[PDB]
Amino acid sequence: GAMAQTPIDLGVVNEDKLIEMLVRTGQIPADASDVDKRIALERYLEEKIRSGFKGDAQFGKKALEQRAKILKVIDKQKGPHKAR
C-alpha cells in the first residue's frame, strides 16, 4: 500500500528525502547544494502551516527573482454592435 508517496517523516529525518522531494515539486532548482537546501527547507516547513505545521522561517533567497507586469496592450477594442 506504499507504491509512490510523499516522504511523511514529519520532522528532522525528512531532510534526507527532501533532497529529491523539494527539487521534484519545483520548490528549489536542480542546482541546489546544502547551502541552497536551507532556502527550500525553511520555506517548506513554513508553507506547511496552511496544512498544519508552523512558521518561524520568513526566509527563502529569491531563486526565481523574475519580472511581473503587463502594459501598452492593456486596452479594449470596438468592433460591430448592431447593423439593422
Side-chain angles (χ1 to χ4, degrees):
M3 175 177 65
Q5 307 183 331
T6 50
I8 306 304
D9 298 279
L10 312 175
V12 179
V13 178
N14 190 218
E15 292 182 62
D16 297 289
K17 278 59 69 64
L18 283 188
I19 207 64
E20 296 183 82
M21 194 186 73
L22 291 174
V23 180
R24 181 210 64 152
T25 306
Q27 304 306 93
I28 190 174
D31 289 89
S33 302
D34 285 76
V35 181
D36 306 89
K37 172 192 171 186
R38 61 133 64 229
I39 303 308
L41 213 181
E42 297 172 83
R43 282 295 301 222
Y44 147 81
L45 58 86
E46 180 167 73
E47 296 176 87
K48 290 303 186 67
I49 199 176
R50 290 73 178 173
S51 47
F53 190 105
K54 73 170 191 56
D56 298 278
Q58 205 177 93
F59 178 54
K61 200 288 301 178
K62 296 161 53 275
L64 294 71
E65 64 175 273
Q66 288 294 89
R67 57 181 179 200
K69 181 172 184 176
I70 182 177
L71 67 167
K72 298 175 62 185
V73 304
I74 301 300
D75 182 55
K76 39 67 184 182
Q77 287 67 87
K78 186 185 184 179
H81 64 288
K82 181 170 178 291
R84 185 181 177 210

